[PDB]
Structure formats: C-alpha cells, structure tokens
Symmetry: C2
Subunit: 131 residues, 2 copies
C-alpha cells in the first residue's frame, strides 16, 4: 500500500473518531477543500482554502447534520490521485435519516492533499436535511 | 494506454458525434448504467439495465436538455476501474446554459463496462433545466 493510500484510509478512521486534528493531518496547508455549490444555502458548499476554513466548515456541519457514518467501498489510485466511492448513513438535525452515496476525489503533493472534493446528489441531501 | 482507457476515451468521442452505437460499443450487454435518484422527476435518474434501457434514457434526454458538451479533464485508472472527472457545458430546452461538473465511474469486465455511473450536483442541474 502506498503512503497516500494509508493517509486516505487513516483520514476516514479519524473522521469516525470525530478527531479534527487527525482529519487535518492529511491536508496540505494550502488545501482547496470543496463541496457542491448546490449546498451553499446551508453554508456547506464551495471551496474552503486552508486549515482554518476547513475547520470552520466542519464546525458548521452540526447545524444541519446530527450524525454521518461513512462506508467507503472502493479506493481507486493512480499516481497522486485517489478516488473513494461509498455510501454514508446520515441523520439530519430534523431527526430523519437516509443512506446516501458519495464520491471523494483526493489529489496529493508530497503526501498531503492539496485538493479534496466531495461529489454527491445534492437534491437528495437537501431533501434529507431541509424542514 | 490500456484497452479499457482507449474504450473510455473513444466513448467520449462517440458522444460528441451523437453516435449512439459508438456509445453502446463500450457497454456490456448486462450493463447497469446509473444516474442520480434526484433526477427521477425528470425521468433521468436511477439504474438502466441493458442496452435497450440505456437507449430509452438517451432518447428521453432531449426532453429537457438541448445540448451537452463534455470536457473530461482527468482519467484515473486502477485495475478494471476508470474514473473520469471534468466539466460539461449544458443548454436546457428552456434556453438557459451553464457549466457544470461531472464524475463518471466505469467498471469493466472483459473490456466492456458492466457498470457506469454519473455523479453530480443534481440541485444545480435541476436549477438549469427547470422552468
């Protein structure tokens, strides 16, 4: 296993522990960390630049999402790029839950992620978290 | 370049030609060809099974989308999986246009795709194609 693959796999372990430093450990200081623009009405869209902006996003997630458990199924590595596909179990602050899909794109430089992006069905995420 | 990579790259060439047989050439007879569930109100969601169901979907696209030009930027291959990321320029039947993102996941068996899936921001696609 490549060091980058270990780093990706370890970031998912950090996430399930609610270990913010462990999640940041994979990311370059100049990271561009992106979520879909369709999530902007919830404050959960766009590109966060650097650790402080990533932390601010993470601290905002509980406003709408009470719990999220990732279940990665597939890790696809080529060069310094790793794509992870899976499902996630999400419980909204409104009390509803659903299983949704995700695709995460990671691009490394020197073993830290310079970009990260989450691609998913935003209409379905919004259907879950809205009133 | 692997044969699967050539097949993927050739399917995008077929798409830009509006060559339906060329697009089907990459797909296994038992293909499971999937779009986001959030697109179901437009008849453009879910999993199509086999060439006939894929053809039916393709023939329905012009109901909502007048033009689509794909601009793949990234091809990430590992084993029999290929992930393509890019942007696409879309013009709706309503006359509006926008540039959107896509992620395509291809999984091959014997050089034909047994699964294909398009992951994208459905809220933004719907914003484009709705009245």
């Amino acid at each position: 296993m490549s060091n980058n693959m270990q780093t990706v796999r370890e970031s998912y372990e950090a996430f399930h522990r609610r270990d913010l430093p462990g999640v940041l450990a994979a990311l370059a200081p100049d990271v561009r960390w992106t979520h879909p623009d369709g999530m902007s009405p919830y404050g959960l869209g766009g590109t966060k630049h650097g650790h402080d902006e990533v932390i601010a996003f993470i601290r905002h997630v509980p406003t709408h999402i009470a719990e999220m458990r990732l279940a990665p199924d597939e890790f696809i590595e080529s060069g310094e790029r790793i794509v992870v596909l899976g499902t996630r179990r999400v419980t909204a602050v409104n009390g509803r839950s659903a299983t949704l899909k995700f695709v995460h794109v990671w691009r490394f430089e020197n073993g830290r992620a310079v970009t990260f992006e989450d691609h998913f069905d935003t209409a379905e995420m919004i259907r879950l978290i809205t009133a």
